[PDB]
Structure formats: structure tokens, C-alpha cells
Design a protein around this ligand. Structure first.
Ligand code: NAI
Ligand code: NAI
Ligand code: NAI
Ligand code: NAI
Ligand code: 9TY
Ligand code: 9TY
Ligand code: 9TY
Ligand code: 9TY
Ligand code: MG
Ligand code: MG
Ligand code: MG
Ligand code: MG
Ligand code: MG
Ligand code: MG
Ligand code: MG
Ligand code: MG
Ligand code: MG
Ligand code: MG
Ligand code: MG
Ligand code: MG
Lengths: 330, 331, 330, 329
């Protein structure tokens, strides 16, 4: 069902050479060392190689690490990890007896872009926070939830390495850790980025556009109600803590009837959408969709940014942020 | 028109360089030696160089090969020729007077991925066997048919090279050799892979799925009728010698009427399909479809294999193969 | 479940009457006399009267036969069995204490065209082979699978007689034997004759027709690729032992992506075509659909044969068989 | 390409044992005797029997006929011919080595309901007339057209027997005879009975029904213009003689433009129809459609007759025929 803790046996004697010192590269670093592990760190000699050395991690080059450690936490992007894996690590992978390879998210594994040896223990360890607030909870010794699983194993005890890191990063005890597979992680992390999020923006991008152009509302008026307030975020504290559906008591009845009746009116209008995009991911199209834009130079990515920023809404909103006293993007 | 045989004049005095020694390697290789020609062979040093070494071919690398021969039999995949042709051969092609390129199939030529010199003759030589069974028919004398044609020539003495290599490969005499172009072969070799083959699988992947989940058949029951028996492959022999439509006498009348009526009921449902996929090939979309997923790292290819093997059908069929005593894969 | 073997008790102390000696006659005939049982055989005097008792099996007429046996293996067509059952056997059926009545396939039972007495042991024993090769499976000792079941019983041991006859036919042991009902047999044997087979022909009858009349291929060219070769041998024999899907390894990658992507494209296009036909069988229409044509002298059957043989394809393919030296229709 | 005549060689030294003496019975019978051929005749004993014998035919029973004749003109219906062919003729068919078998129309052959030996000469001889007027075309000597062909031969000269009978029936010389096969005959004879004829009736059954109920015309008024006059049948003679499209010259211009423009307006509305019915015949359904109705006792056939006769149109038309002084049914 769900795990709460495990023995912390294996990794006392084996070394862990971490790769990357990004956002997650700074949260896992602090914890495993502060829970009983000798560790070195990996990052190419740019600005980041000088900082985490000030954390006492005797940082070397990337390939210096995997040639020492039986583990490597590849806390680096899900996009350029391809480039690394075939210049450096694969010539290093085949030249090894045993190795335990872990990732954060599996946009590259689940969609088949990585096929490591059968001499390697494959696992996943997914934090479920943006990366900043996690440091408010670790100081509190507070666990937090993680997703796990396996793609490939040749050891029998591949899971305890994950359950070890499941206690190595301090995410448990206090929280929980889910058993799963790689497919069921990348599916969700992208489903948020396809179906429920962007529709939130379109409605806010349409209701405003529908108010001014058609129904005559002034631009400065509307945005104070839709999202320029903190209600759309201050609501989220209730959801994470007081629950989704009990949240509606804190708005009066006249908002409930208007909201619940429509939630079921326009339910089948969006389940039809989600059935398409998920099937557009289970097949791996979104990887072949993205992985060619990279091989063209981000044309569309450039344009749509050149529209939404230069759209009608941010125009009038930039005057608001110019008028509430906050910053103004160059 | 359909030819049977020709003179075997030109290649007496020109060395037969050969590239690749794969499945079609051993097909054409020991026939040109057997029917009286000199050969050097091309391949890249790996396990296939071993069995290639055991057969008396005096083998060099590829660049040294074409620097000797006026002909070449590029019996290598239809996918990595692009890699080879621009590293090795093209710097050698422009440094060659006259040369005659032969291929198996033209997925790369017909779709324009290869632009050889004007100083070169171009031909196609396609067998229509899988590759294994030729030495059951070859030593037996009864040959097998081939397809031919031209894309580009600057010689006027072109077709005899193909008709020469046609005897170089032993598929003639006894068999035949069809006159055609590059387009009309690569069109067909994929039309099988798009329209009539996969629909065969879907129906078998639906009728089973429709029997169990809706009509209550046990899974171990059905598969013994659909394809796991000697019903399907055993009748391919009747179609090969006794003819397609005369095959149906060997099933009684109650099976005939149910089949012929539906063959014409659901004909316009599939011609409707085939009109689309062929036009999706005549234009070259399928090459621009394949050419990119290569340049992404086989994402979709990985997934569908990760579905059909992990689907419902193979699961219960893997238990069957675990139960008839035959092999079952380590995966 | 998949039963493998049983005691062979019941069929000792009787005589095994058998009706019909067609293809499946000599299949089962050879084995009951081989595996230690007494037999008389039933067939109505024609050429088959020659070869049947020429192999030793004593013969009386059918009415002279079923009166001797408690069992009977009606290995005759699924079409004219109606004619026999009401002239001869039914006047003989009522004149029995017990009786055991077995068939090969149940196009006549499951669709209600036979309703035997109350004291008959009704069973099914279905081979799943064409009939010829069974001696290539038999003398190697390897069994092969059979389908079974019951419709109407008044004896308590309706299944042991089937399991008894199951060992009387040589298909077990070594192979298997499935428990089922009559409905689940005729459903499949006809579904192959309705959905996946004829579509195989139409595509081959369309792609060729579409190549020549629209895309300019010469007729002698195409057929050498589609089906005029024995390529279908070396693709489905792989399916017989090397598996449906693992056979794709023996075709290169470019033939896979073109095939698997389309198998899922045109899946829902054919599941419709199956659902409409199976429901046309579960209701019993196809038995009525045949049964009236039989009562009109095979008009349509005569015509479609006068089309498919006189079509464009055989008009050209016959000249190829006229040209490879293989047999032409004599 | 078309034939006009042949040598009259084969049928000398034989006897032509005819079966049936119906409407076409007296068509072919009178002529074969009166152009130099010996004949016996076949018909099962009813009122029709002795009238042929009253005209000199040495008649016997049916099965008597075939054993005296290498030929058999089966001038009988296309429906009960099945009943005969398996009770009587099939036990008799193998009595001959060579035997010749001729029909009028092939609703039973082309749709596969007959499969004779491979030692029998199979042919078709189709007159194209009702049967009454042939003895107006005959005495004047002017021939008339026929359709021919073969289904099965085991003799090498299956055609001169047809070209022989082609002079046995007198339809040539003077006329023509077309080369064809069985399929291309039954296709046409039924296509007339499916597409162009019944639509003629429906329009006449609708335009009237549309005039009275909707647009207010009286019933006695309209029918005098639509079909109760002999114009419509007199519109036909000009077609048979002066040709289809030159026929319209005898109607003034205001009727032409109203007719030609609509002939092309509502063309694809009926080609869309005909494509369905012919394919409903080429596959052989209409024989299976009919053949089962015979095996159910003509239920529908009874009803539609019980409707169209008891419809609104014949009701008011029967009063008109009751009013012009002609018959009343
Ligand atoms: N705070 C966040 O945004 C969270 C990130 N993740 C996961 O973290 C992983 C990466 O995210 P972050 O690094 O934390 O944020 P980030 O976007 O700031 O990543 C920057 C990192 O990329 C590294 N890098 C990229 N290419 C490199 C190359 N050729 N050589 C050396 N270093 C290279 C750099 O060292 C740098 O540290 C992803 O897989 C993601 O799934 C998961 C939860 C939230
Ligand atoms: N059953 C089949 O696969 C048949 C093959 N063909 C055609 O023959 C050609 C190739 O067929 P096969 O070689 O027999 O199949 P294959 O998949 O077994 O090819 C492997 C062979 O190609 C060579 N090779 C492979 N990759 C190479 C690379 N990167 N660099 C250098 N050499 C490499 C190797 O020497 C190896 O022996 C294709 O055009 C194919 O369409 C046509 C008839 C049947
Ligand atoms: N390859 C096959 O045909 C197989 C046959 N079966 C089943 O076996 C049964 C019949 O199969 P077969 O006899 O082998 O095929 P078949 O169509 O060749 O039947 C020939 C036999 O039927 C007998 N027969 C035919 N007409 C008869 C009649 N009017 N009166 C009396 N006897 C007549 C004859 O004695 C002859 O021996 C069916 O239930 C069929 O489903 C099942 C597995 C495969
Ligand atoms: N106006 C027409 O109906 C024409 C007739 N035909 C063809 O002539 C053939 C039959 O036409 P007709 O005989 O002239 O019309 P009919 O309907 O008047 O036939 C009645 C004749 O057929 C015989 N007969 C009827 N029922 C019989 C039965 N149960 N058993 C034995 N004999 C029976 C009788 O001797 C009787 O004289 C058909 O094949 C038809 O296609 C073709 C051209 C025109
Ligand atoms: O913010 C809301 O949702 C309000 C409501 O009750 O409708 C205005 C207070
Ligand atoms: O006659 C049939 O329907 C069978 C077939 O295999 O197609 C024997 C069962
Ligand atoms: O690789 C292919 O496409 C071939 C096939 O037969 O399917 C060999 C030609
Ligand atoms: O019969 C016709 O068609 C008439 C016309 O000229 O319109 C009335 C005479
Ligand atoms: Mg970088
Ligand atoms: Mg994501
Ligand atoms: Mg996420
Ligand atoms: Mg290689
Ligand atoms: Mg191909
Ligand atoms: Mg091929
Ligand atoms: Mg019989
Ligand atoms: Mg069947
Ligand atoms: Mg079957
Ligand atoms: Mg009568
Ligand atoms: Mg008619
Ligand atoms: Mg007519």
C-alpha cells in the first residue's frame, strides 16, 4: 500500500557521487550528509562548482564521481541529460561491475530515451515540492511525500537503495513514500502541464477579453478580482490543509450553487480533452513533439512568448504593476 | 515484359565488390562464386566478419573495396546507408570513373535521400524471399522471381549489368524478372507493412478482446483457434501453389458463404483506407515520418513495444507457451 | 481449467459406433483402435465405403450401427446433419435407455437446430487442426488442444465420456483440453470466417487493384510481393512457436514503426466490424442466413464464385501460375 | 459487330422435341415446321395439350420428347422450371451423350439454379416481343431481333445450333441477332421490371395524388390527361419508329424546354437508384428474394395487389371505365 520507513542498511560503505547542484541539487545535499553519509558532488566547472564546495563537499568533475561511487543522483534537467549520458557516463557505465542509477522525473526514461546496462540498478526518487519550501520543513524534521519505483534491476535488493534514499533525503519518516513505476510519474507531471493548468489561464484570458471587448468592463477594474489579488493563491492554503471540497464553506451559499452545478455541467466537456492528451502521452508523442523543436531552435517557443507577453492582458497588467509600486519587467 | 534469362557477358573482367554480408549476404555471395565470377567483399569487423571470414572471401574494408570494383551490391540496411554513403562512398564516387550501384530495396533512393553522380549507373535487384529458404530452392534449381529497373544512367549499356547480376544471384533461370522502376517496388514493400498486415493483427487483437470482455470466452480457449494452431500458417502453402481462391474448397460450404459475402461487404471499408496510406507514401510522408523519430531516439517505437508485449493478449499467450512446452522469452 | 489427462474407465465394455469417415474420420478412427477399444464404423455407401473398411473397421449401416453402441461420433458435415438426424437417428434415439452423442463443431446444436432426448449424454469434442497433419503430431506422441463442454445431461458423468473420448482421439495427453460450452465454440469457428480472414483478402484485393488502376504498377509485378510467394509461410510459422509479436524481430525496424503505429490507428475501425458480426451470430441470424440460401439452391454462392474467379486478379494470377510451371486448373 | 444469317446445316437428320406450348409456344412452333424441320412437342396434359395436336404436332408426354430429340426448347415459365428439371429431365439427361438445351430467358440459369452435365450444349434464344405481334412480323417476312450466347459447351459447335434455331424461329433473316452471354440477358429483363417501369407508375400515382389532395383538381379531370388516354402508348410508337429524341419534335417548343432541362436535373437522382438495384441483381439477391417468397405462399404479392387495386386511383378510375362503356374489373 504505502511505506512509512525502512532500515538504513546498505549505503554505509558505498559512496554517493551526486551530479548537479541546481534546486534539488541543494536540498538532497544537505540531508544525506546530515543523516550519516560520506559524499562527493558532481557538476561541470562553472559557477556552481565553486559554491557547493563551500558546503565542504569535495567536488570534482562529473566523470570523477561515477568512477568512484556506486551511486549517482542525477539531479539535473530532464532535457540535456541525454547529451551528458552519451558523452561521459555511457563510456563510464560499461566499465563498471555494479551501479545504482537514480533520477528525479522520468520524461527521458519512460519515453525510452535511456537504456542503461543490465549491470545497473535502476530506480526513481521524486520529490513533490517546488524546491524552496522543502527547506522550511527539513529544519522542522518533517517528512514529505515521494514517489518511487523501478524500471530495471539485477540485484534482488534494488528497492532498499531507494528506500535508503527515501530516508537519505529525509522525505520520510514523517510523511510517506509510494510504490509505483516510472510511467505513472511522468504521466502526471505532464498532465498538469497540459490539461488543468492551461485551461485555468485561457478562462482568465477569455473572461477578461470577453468583459472588455463585448460587455464593456474597463481593464483596470476586472483584473483586481480575477487574479491580480492573492485570493487565487491564498485559496490554495485552504485546499492543501482544509481540503478541496470543504473549502467552499468559506464562500457563502450563493457561490456554491453557481459553482457546483457548473462543475458537473462542464465536466464531460473536459474529460473529453483529458482523454486525448493522456493518450497523446501514453504513446510518447509529446516526447517526439518536444524532441524535434529542440532540433529546430525553439521557433514556436519564441513566438508564443512573443505573443502572450505582447498580448492585450499583460499590456494593461504591466501598467497595474507599474501602479501598485512593484517591479516592472524590462 | 517478364524475362526469363539473358546473356552473361559484361562482368567477365570486372571485379564484383560486395558491401554487407547480412541475411542477403549469404544469399547472393556464394552464387556469384558458384556461377563463375571473382569477388571481393565489404563489411565492418564484428561477429559478422567471423562467418564472413570462413568462406574464402578476400576481405578488405569498404573504401578499399570500391577503389577496385566497377560494380557494388550494397546489401546493407535501408536505414544506415545515409550514414555510410556520405562518409565513405561519396568521396570515393567522385574519385571513380564509372560505377554501377545495385540495391535490394529503394526506400532511400525513391524518396530522394541519395543523389549519386552522373558518372554512375543505377539499378535495382530485389528478391522477394525472406532470405533463408533460397538454398532449399536454389540447389533444387527451381529459382525465384525478382524486380528490376533504373533510376539514372549515363552509359546506354545499363540493363545487361542488372540482367547479368540477375544471373549473378541465381534467382534466374527457372524463375522470372519483372521490369519496373524504383518507385513501384518501395511502394509495395511498405504497403504490406501498412494496410493488410496490421489489420490482420488488430482483428485478432479485437476478436479475442471482444470475446473475453463482452461475450465471456475463457482466454486459454480462444487463442487455440485464432492463430496459435496450425490453421493459419499451414494454409499459406495452399495460397502459394493451389491459388488464393481455390484454397476455399478445402473449407466446406458453410465457411465459404460467410467469408465471400463479407469480403465484399467490407471491401469499400478498406479500399477507403488504402487510398490514404499509399498517398501517404507516394508523397514521401512516411520517410519524413520515419526520418525524424530516428533523430529523436525511438520514443514511440519503445512505447508500443512496451504496450503490445505488456498487453493483455501476450500475457495469457505467454502462459500458453509456458504450457505447451515451447520456448518462452526471458522478458 | 486446462485439463491434461483422466482415467479411461467408462468406454470399456461397449462398442464404439462412429458415423462419417471423412477427413476427421481417419483422424480419430486410427487412434481408438490403436489405443485399445472396439469399433464399428458408420458411413453410407460410396467411394468412402471402399477405403474405410479397407482399413479393417467393420461396417454396418447407420440404423444397424447406433443400435449397437451407447456412444456415437457424428463426424459428418455441419450442414446435412439435419437431414440425417430426423430420418434415421431420432426414431433410433427414443429406442434407448442411455446414449452418448458427440459432435465436432456445434453450428447445429448451439443455434438450436437439434434438441435430443432427455436420456442422452450430450458433449462436444472439437479438434483445432485441419486434419491432415495430425499423423505428423500423432506418431511423435505429442498431443494437441481440444475444446469440450456439455449441453444436456441426465447421467452425472457427462464429462468423463468426453474426457474418455478425449484420450480416444490421441489429442491428449501432451497437449491440453479446455472446459467450455457449445456456444463458445461455434462463435469462434465462424468469427474467423467473418472478420479477420475476409478482410485479409479485401486488402490484398484492394492494394493490387489500387496499385494498377491508380498508381500504375504492372500486374505481374505486384503479386510476387503480396501473396504469390510463400512469404506467409515464414511469417506465421514464426507465430506458431516464436510468438505473434516477437516475430517482428525478423523484420527490420523500418517495417515495425510502419506496422505497429497503424495497428493502433485502424484498431477501432475494425472492432466495430467485429461487434456488428458477433452480435449477428450470438442472436443466431447467420444460421438463418445460411439456412434459407440452402433452401433456394445456392444462388448467391454461385454468383460470387462466378465473380471472384472471373475477377481481374485471378485473370492475371492464373497466367502467372501458367508461367511459373505450377499447376493450372485442369 | 453483329450477325445476320448462317448455314442451316445441323438440324437435318434430327427431331426437335419442344417443351411447353404457351404464348411463345406458337411463336417458335409454327416457324420451325414451316421452314423445313421435323418436330414433336411436349406439354403436360391440361387444356393446352390437344390444341397443339389439333395443329398437327405429334405430341407425347414431356419425357417422351427428350428421348426422341437431341434438342429441347424449354418454352415454359422461369419459375416452375426448377420443379420439372429435377423430377423428370435430370433422370433423363444422362440418357443422352450429346443433348442440346435452349431457353428463352435465364433467370434460372444465370443465377445458378441449374447445373446440367458437361456433355450438354447450353444456349440461349431470346425473342424480344410479347408474342402476339410476331405473326405480323412473320407473314411480312420482316425479321426481329434476338439475343444469344453460351454458358457451357462440350461439343465445339455450340453456336451453329443457336444460329440454326436462329433460322428455326424466323427472327432472322431480315432482322438481327446479338452475341452475348446469359448474364447480360436476365440483367436487362429484370432491370426494366425494377427501375424505369415502376417509377413511371409512382409518378402517375403521385402527380394525381398530389393534384387532388393538395392542389384541388378533381379525380375525373386529371386521369384523362395522365394515362386514361391512348396518348402515352401512342407516345411509344414514335419512339419505336421515329426514334426517342426526334419524338419531341412533334410536341411544341414549350414542352421541350420543360422536359429536357428536367431530364438532366433529375438524372443523378435516378442513376443513384439504378446503381443500387443492378448491384442487387449482379450479386444474385433478387433470385433469393423471390425464391423464398415462393416458399412462403405469396404473402406480400397478395397484399400489394390487395392495395393497388383497392387504392384511391383505381377506385375512381373504375368509375371512369364504368362510364366509357368498357369492361369493369
Ligand atoms: N525546484 C524545481 O524546479 C524542481 C526540479 N525537479 C527535477 O530537478 C531536475 C533539475 O532541476 P534543477 O537542477 O533543480 O533546476 P534548474 O532548472 O535551475 O537546473 C539547472 C542545472 O542544470 C545543470 N546542467 C545542465 N546541463 C548541464 C551540463 N552539460 N553540464 C553540467 N551541468 C548541467 C546545471 O549544473 C544546473 O545546476 C529535473 O529533473 C526535475 O525533474 C523536480 C521537482 C521540482
Ligand atoms: N529478410 C530480410 O530482412 C531481407 C533483406 N532485404 C534487404 O537487404 C538489405 C539489408 O538486409 P540484411 O543485411 O540481410 O538484414 P540485417 O538486419 O541482418 O543487416 C545486418 C547486416 O548488415 C551489416 N551492417 C549492419 N549495420 C551496419 C552498420 N552500421 N555499418 C556497417 N554495416 C552494417 C552488417 O554487416 C550485418 O551483417 C535491405 O535493403 C533489406 O530491405 C530484402 C529481402 C529480405
Ligand atoms: N478440415 C476440416 O474439414 C475439419 C472438419 N471438422 C468438422 O468435421 C465434421 C465434418 O468434417 P469432414 O467429414 O471431415 O469434411 P467433408 O466435407 O470432406 O465430409 C466428407 C464426409 O462426409 C460424409 N458425407 C458427406 N455427405 C454425406 C451425406 N449426404 N450423407 C451421409 N454422409 C455424408 C461422407 O461420408 C464423407 O466421408 C464437421 O463437423 C466439421 O466442423 C472440424 C476440424 C477440421
Ligand atoms: N409475353 C411473354 O410472357 C413472353 C414469354 N417469354 C418466356 O417464355 C417462357 C414462358 O412463357 P409462356 O409459356 O409463353 O407464358 P404462360 O404464362 O402463358 O405459360 C403457360 C404455358 O406454360 C405451360 N406450363 C405452365 N405451367 C406449367 C407447369 N406447372 N407444368 C408444366 N407446364 C406448365 C403450359 O403448357 C402453358 O401452356 C418464359 O421463359 C419467358 O421468359 C419471353 C418473351 C415474351
Ligand atoms: O469573492 C467572492 O467569491 C464573493 C462572493 O460571495 O461571491 C464576493 C465575496
Ligand atoms: O468448417 C469450419 O468452419 C472449420 C474451420 O476451421 O474453419 C472446421 C471448423
Ligand atoms: O524490410 C522490408 O520492408 C522487407 C519486407 O519483406 O517486409 C524486406 C523487404
Ligand atoms: O400534350 C401536350 O403536351 C400539349 C402541349 O403542347 O403542351 C397539350 C398539347
Ligand atoms: Mg550546461
Ligand atoms: Mg513535467
Ligand atoms: Mg511536477
Ligand atoms: Mg554497424
Ligand atoms: Mg518494406
Ligand atoms: Mg518486403
Ligand atoms: Mg451424401
Ligand atoms: Mg466455421
Ligand atoms: Mg475452424
Ligand atoms: Mg402446371
Ligand atoms: Mg423479367
Ligand atoms: Mg422482358
Amino acid at each position: 500500500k504505502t511505506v512509512l520507513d525502512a532500515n538504513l542498511d546498505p549505503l554505509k560503505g558505498k559512496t554517493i557521487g551526486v551530479i548537479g547542484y541546481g534546486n534539488q541539487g541543494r536540498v538532497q545535499a544537505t540531508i544525506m550528509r546530515e543523516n550519516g553519509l560520506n559524499v562527493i558532488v558532481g557538476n561541470v566547472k562553472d559557477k556552481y562548482y565553486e559554491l557547493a564546495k563551500k558546503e565542504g563537499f569535495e567536488v570534482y568533475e562529473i566523470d570523477e564521481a561515477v568512477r568512484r561511487s556506486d551511486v549517482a543522483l542525477l539531479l539535473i534537467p530532464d532535457e540535456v541529460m541525454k547529451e551528458v549520458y552519451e558523452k561521459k557516463i555511457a563510456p563510464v557505465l560499461q566499465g563498471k561491475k555494479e551501479f545504482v542509477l537514480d533520477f528525479a522525473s522520468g520524461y527521458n526514461v519512460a519515453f525510452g530515451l535511456i537504456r542503461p546496462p543490465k549491470s545497473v540498478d535502476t530506480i526513481m526518487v521524486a520529490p513533490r515540492m517546488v524546491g524552496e519550501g522543502i527547506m522550511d520543513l527539513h529544519k522542522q524534521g518533517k517528512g514529505y511525500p515521494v514517489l518511487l519505483g523501478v524500471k530495471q534491476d539485477a540485484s534482488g535488493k534494488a528497492w532498499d537503495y531507494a528506500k535508503a534514499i527515501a530516508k537519505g533525503i529525509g522525505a520520510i519518516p514523517g510523511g510517506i513514500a509510494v510504490i509505483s513505476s516510472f510511467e505513472e510519474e511522468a504521466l502526471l507531471d505532464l498532465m498538469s502541464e497540459h490539461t488543468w493548468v492551461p485551461i485555468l489561464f485561457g478562462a482568465i484570458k477569455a473572461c477578461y477579453d470577453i468583459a472588455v471587448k463585448e460587455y464593456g468592463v474597463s481593464p483596470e477594474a476586472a483584473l483586481l478580482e480575477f487574479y491580480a489579488s492573492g485570493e487565487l493563491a491564498e485559496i490554495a492554503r485552504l485546499i492543501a490543509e482544509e481540503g478541496i471540497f470543504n473549502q467552499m464553506v468559506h464562500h457563502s451559499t450563493t457561490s456554491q450553487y453557481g459553482t457546483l452545478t457548473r462543475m458537473f455541467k462542464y465536466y464531460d466537456v473536459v474529460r473529453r480533452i483529458v482523454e486525448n492528451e493522456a493518450k497523446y502521452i501514453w504513446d510518447g508523442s509529446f516526447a517526439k513533439e518536444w524532441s524535434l523543436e529542440q532540433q529546430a531552435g525553439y521557433p514556436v517557443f519564441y513566438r508564443l512568448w512573443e505573443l502572450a507577453t505582447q498580448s492585450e492582458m499583460a499590456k494593461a497588467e504591466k501598467e497595474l504593476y507599474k501602479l501598485l509600486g512593484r517591479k516592472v519587467k524590462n
